[PDB]
Amino acid sequence: KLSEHLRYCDSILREMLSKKHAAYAWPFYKPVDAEALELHDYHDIIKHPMDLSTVKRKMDGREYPDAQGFAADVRLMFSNCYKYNPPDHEVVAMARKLQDVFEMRFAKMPDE
């Protein structure tokens, strides 16, 4: 049982996971596997990892009290990407493209 406003957030999450954004959303479909990739400083630099699979599990588990809590996790996910990766990296460009989608949708949903 999600509130009307969190239902709009769930719709945004579904859009971010949809096929049309797959070319730039895929880095965010699961946590960064720093051990498998041997990025040995990832967790020293990124104190609070976040990704869309975790956001979805929290949404489905009714863990977000309001839209701002959902948006905080989405923005944390993007901020981690900007913090960890080189500024000209392909994955930073993908983050910006997906964040543009998110910020437009989040801005435009009904109020309250």
């Binding site: 895929w26 990739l37 041997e38 990025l39 040995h40 990766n85 990296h89 994955v91």
Partner: peptide, 17 residues
């Protein structure tokens, strides 16, 4: 997805797809 070999090699994310 990431190229595991090259990501480990260079210490930064390397895109395979």
């Amino acid at each position: 997805w990431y190229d595991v070999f090259l990501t480990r090699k260079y210490g930064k994310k390397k895109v395979a797809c």
